[PDB]
């Protein structure tokens, strides 16, 4: 990841990297 | 919200994550 200014499509892209990829990527057992 | 955190000035993964709620 990069800490920077983010807006519009760049902000939607960041939300995919932090949260959206983790929506379909695997989650192991606790 | 998230635009007032990241568009105006620098935000980071560990805090921008919080807005996916």
Radius of gyration of chain A measured on its C-alpha atoms: 12
Chains A and B form CB pairs within 8 A to the count of 36
Query: Contacts of residue B12 in chain A, CB cutoff 8 Å?
Result: 1, 3
Q: How far apart are the first and last CA of chain A?
A: 26
Instruction: Determine the 3-state secondary structure of A4 from DSSP.
Output: strand
**Contact assignment for A18 to B16 by CB distance below 8 Å:** yes
**Method for this entry:** NMR
Distance from C-alpha of A24 to C-alpha of B7, rounded to nearest angstrom: 27
CA distances from A17 to A10, A29, B9 (A): 11, 22, 19
């Amino acid at each position: 990841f990069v800490n920077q200014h983010l807006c519009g499509s760049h902000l939607v892209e960041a939300l995919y990297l932090v949260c959206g990829e983790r929506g379909h990527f695997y989650t192991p057992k606790t | 919200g998230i635009v007032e955190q990241c568009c105006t000035s620098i935000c980071s993964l560990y805090q921008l994550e919080n807005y996916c709620n």
